[PDB]
């Protein structure tokens, strides 16, 4: 019902139901909630990541009071970016997506703000 | 299909004439029918939990599922076969059965895998063959 039952669901997806997820896919998994660690913290992580460690890491590092804090930047929050200019930042930086990019904007809806995106992503999760 | 056992299992698990859905499903599985949560809820919004033989026959038909085969079920198991070997890890196949659809607990699915084959790499093709039987 809570986050505990939702975290387990998210592991079986990124691991593709694997017991031991690959380091790179584990980072996709943490980010999907609103978890980003410091350069040092990201080295403190174990060699082989498993479900048991993932769920401990989930409790500690996930934001509960405001699930997506990392999206808020208040110079970037209040400001309105056009749909085309927003995709410009996205297409150059992108490390994941291909055509699921059009589907992210649909999850939000011309001029958008970060507090709108975070609010909609809180309902997505 | 066995017509004789249909009536026998009804009166055996009947109570005050009417039969409870839990028992109707139990009898469906006793014959060789596979009721899911979708088939179970369809009858709930009609005459209640307890329903007579008149209504029990209508539930026997919703449990038939004639259009069931090897590729009508693997739509979730092939979805997780990124390795392209056909063989799927016991544990991989396990967690699939626990999290989504019908609530099959760890022990329910765990023992079902080992009962089919002892090996870790289990083909979800040969798996459909016997559970559908």
Automatic annotation (TrEMBL), chain A:
Official protein name in the record: Myosin essential light chain ELC
Entry's CDD domains? ELC_N (cd22949)
Q: Which domain of life is it from?
A: Eukaryota
TrEMBL record, chain B:
Q: Which UniProt keywords apply?
A: Acetylation, Metal-binding, Repeat
Q: Which residues form the EF-hand domain?
A: 68-103
An example of a Gene Ontology cellular component annotation for this protein is: myosin II complex
Is Acetylation a UniProt keyword of this protein?
A: yes
On whether Metal-binding is a keyword of this UniProt record, the answer is: yes
GO molecular function annotations of the record: calcium ion binding
Q: What is the protein's name according to its record?
A: Calmodulin
Q: Which organism is it from?
A: Plasmodium falciparum (isolate NF54)
């Amino acid at each position: 019902s809570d986050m505990e039952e939702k975290f387990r669901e998210a592991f079986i997806l990124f691991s593709s139901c694997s017991d031991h997820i690959e380091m790179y896919k584990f980072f996709e998994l943490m980010n999907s909630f609103g978890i980003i660690l410091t350069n040092d913290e990201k080295a403190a992580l174990p060699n082989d990541i498993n479900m048991d460690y993932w769920l401990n890491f989930a409790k500690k590092h996930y934001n509960y009071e405001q699930p997506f804090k990392h999206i808020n930047n208040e110079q970037n929050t209040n400001v309105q970016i056009k749909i085309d200019n927003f995709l410009g930042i996205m297409k150059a930086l992108d490390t994941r997506l291909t055509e699921s990019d059009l589907n992210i904007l649909l999850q939000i809806t011309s001029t958008l703000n970060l507090k709108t995106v975070s609010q909609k992503l809180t309902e997505s999760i | 299909v066995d017509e004789s056992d249909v009536r026998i299992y009804f009166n055996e698990k009947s109570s005050g004439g009417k039969i409870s859905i839990d028992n109707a499903s139990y009898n469906a599985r006793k014959l060789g029918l596979a009721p899911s949560s979708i088939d179970e809820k369809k009858i709930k919004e009609l005459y209640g939990d307890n329903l007579t033989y008149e209504q029990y026959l209508e539930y026997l038909s919703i449990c038939v599922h004639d259009k069931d085969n090897v590729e009508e079920l693997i739509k979730m198991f092939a979805h997780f076969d990124n390795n392209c070997t056909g063989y799927l890890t016991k544990s991989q196949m396990k967690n699939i059965l626990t999290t989504w659809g019908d609530a099959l607990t760890d022990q329910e699915a765990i023992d079902a895998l080992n009962a089919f084959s002892s090996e870790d790499n289990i083909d979800y093709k040969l798996f459909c063959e016997d559970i559908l039987q």
